[PDB]
Design a protein around this motif. Structure first.
Motif, PDB file in Angstrom:
ATOM      1  N   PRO A 276       0.816  -1.218   0.000  1.00 41.25           N
ATOM      2  CA  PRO A 276       0.000   0.000   0.000  1.00 41.25           C
ATOM      3  C   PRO A 276       0.849   1.267   0.000  1.00 41.25           C
ATOM      4  CG  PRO A 276       0.036  -0.968   2.188  1.00 41.25           C
ATOM      5  CD  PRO A 276       0.736  -1.942   1.280  1.00 41.25           C
ATOM      6  N   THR A 277       2.012   1.194   0.639  1.00 41.01           N
ATOM      7  CA  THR A 277       2.916   2.335   0.712  1.00 41.01           C
ATOM      8  C   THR A 277       3.092   2.986  -0.654  1.00 41.01           C
ATOM      9  OG1 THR A 277       4.169   1.412   2.586  1.00 41.01           O
ATOM     10  CG2 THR A 277       5.254   3.107   1.252  1.00 41.01           C
ATOM     11  N   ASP A 278       2.816   4.283  -0.727  1.00 46.48           N
ATOM     12  CA  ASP A 278       2.947   5.024  -1.977  1.00 46.48           C
ATOM     13  C   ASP A 278       4.386   4.986  -2.484  1.00 46.48           C
ATOM     14  OD1 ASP A 278       0.296   5.766  -2.337  1.00 46.48           O
ATOM     15  OD2 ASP A 278       0.503   7.565  -1.091  1.00 46.48           O
ATOM     16  N   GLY A 279       4.551   4.618  -3.751  1.00 48.18           N
ATOM     17  CA  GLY A 279       5.879   4.547  -4.333  1.00 48.18           C
ATOM     18  C   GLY A 279       6.480   3.159  -4.237  1.00 48.18           C
ATOM     19  N   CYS A 280       6.325   2.528  -3.079  1.00 45.39           N
ATOM     20  CA  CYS A 280       6.859   1.189  -2.859  1.00 45.39           C
ATOM     21  C   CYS A 280       6.406   0.234  -3.960  1.00 45.39           C
ATOM     22  CB  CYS A 280       6.416   0.658  -1.494  1.00 45.39           C
ATOM     23  SG  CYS A 280       7.478  -0.665  -0.831  1.00 45.39           S
ATOM     24  N   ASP A 281       7.339  -0.568  -4.460  1.00 44.64           N
ATOM     25  CA  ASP A 281       7.036  -1.528  -5.516  1.00 44.64           C
ATOM     26  C   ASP A 281       7.260  -2.956  -5.032  1.00 44.64           C
ATOM     27  OD1 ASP A 281       6.730   0.796  -7.053  1.00 44.64           O
ATOM     28  OD2 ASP A 281       7.498  -0.211  -8.849  1.00 44.64           O
TER      29      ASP A 281
ATOM     30  N   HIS B 172       8.491   0.138   6.633  1.00 41.71           N
ATOM     31  CA  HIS B 172       8.259   1.569   6.464  1.00 41.71           C
ATOM     32  C   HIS B 172       8.074   2.253   7.815  1.00 41.71           C
ATOM     33  CE1 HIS B 172       7.780   0.343   2.346  1.00 41.71           C
ATOM     34  NE2 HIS B 172       6.667  -0.317   2.612  1.00 41.71           N
TER      35      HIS B 172
END
Ligand code: ZN
Length: 38
Positions: free
Chosen positions: A13-18, A34
């Motif tokens: 869900p973390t924005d940017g995290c892939d 995170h």
């Protein structure tokens, strides 16, 4: 509430995290990478 596939890659869900894994538990732990700070 059907599921069908019953198994799909969970994209963090973390924005940017892939980060994505077919395992649910594993993910939960990753989500800590995170919000992890001494
Ligand atoms: Zn992440």
């Amino acid at each position: 509430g059907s599921s069908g596939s019953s198994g799909i890659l969970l994209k963090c869900p973390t924005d940017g995290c892939d980060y994505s894994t077919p395992d649910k538990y594993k993910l939960q732990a990753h989500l800590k990478v995170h919000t992890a700070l001494d």
